[PDB]
Structures are given as C-alpha cells and as structure tokens.
C-alpha cells in the first residue's frame, strides 16, 4: 500500500514554483548550542535578541531597520536557507515608538512579498 501511495503522488502532475528570490545558503557564524548559555531558563533576566538572530540566519547577516528608534523592538531583513525573511523580535517592553516601528516594517514586507 505504501508503494502504491508513492506512485499515486507521482501522478499528481504538480511542480513547485517559488515566488521569492533565492540566494545560496550559508551556515550561521556562531554555534547554535551557545543559545543554551545565552538564554537560560530564567525569564526575569534579559538577553539581546540579536544574539538569537545571529545564530539562525545565513552567515549571521542582518540589516536592521530603524535601529535607534523604538529600540525595545528589533526588525530587519535576513535570509534562512536562501529564503528572504523579515524578522520581528522583542527586546524589552513595548512602547508607542516600538509599535509604530513594527507597523511600518510589516507594511514593507507585505509590499515586497
């Protein structure tokens, strides 16, 4: 039955098509297991979300958007396995500036798909 199922799927006449631009993949520049020490299990302590980003994006490359405005929120462009991604991460309490900065960023990503 499992062999038959594989044959059925092969006859779906489907081919995947990508709407986004693609670039060659690259591993992050830092080990992922270091996230254990950086983050820990105590939610009262705070850490820089950029450290988490640096260990998951291709080549640890990140273009920050509105870095000095609403600094409690981090937004920027990166790539994961070649796919383009816009990252929004908390770095503190949300403020009016942070919400405005996020709203501006989300419009940018939607415009460019």
């Amino acid at each position: 039955a499992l062999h038959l199922t594989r044959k059925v799927v092969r006859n779906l006449n489907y081919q995947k098509k990508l709407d986004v631009t693609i670039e060659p993949s690259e591993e992050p520049l830092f080990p992922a297991d270091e996230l254990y020490g950086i983050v820990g299990a105590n939610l009262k302590r705070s850490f820089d979300v950029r450290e988490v980003i640096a260990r998951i994006v291709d080549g640890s490359r990140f273009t920050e958007f509105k870095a000095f405005y609403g600094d409690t929120l981090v937004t920027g462009f990166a790539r994961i396995f070649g796919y383009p991604v816009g990252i929004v991460g908390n770095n503190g309490v949300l403020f009016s500036e942070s919400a405005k900065k996020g709203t501006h960023f989300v419009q940018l990503c939607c415009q460019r798909n």
Binding site: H3, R6, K7, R10
Partner: protein, 35 residues
C-alpha cells in the same frame, strides 16, 4: 525522487502459434495495400 522500480505491461506473443501467423499475414497485406 524518481528511482522507484515499477512493473511493466506487455507479454511476449507466441510467434509459432497459428493464430499469430494468420493475424500477421492478414494485417501485413492490409498495410502493403495501404502503402
């Protein structure tokens, strides 16, 4: 992945069989007439 082995149709006809000999002869004449 397209490396799966699969079954194939068809069987080898009995060329010696009288039916096959007669059928081949009749169809061949039609094809020659067409040509």
């Amino acid at each position: 992945y397209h490396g799966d082995s699969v079954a194939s149709l068809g069987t080898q006809p009995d060329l010696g069989s009288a039916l096959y000999q007669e059928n081949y002869k009749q169809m061949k004449a039609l094809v020659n007439q067409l040509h």
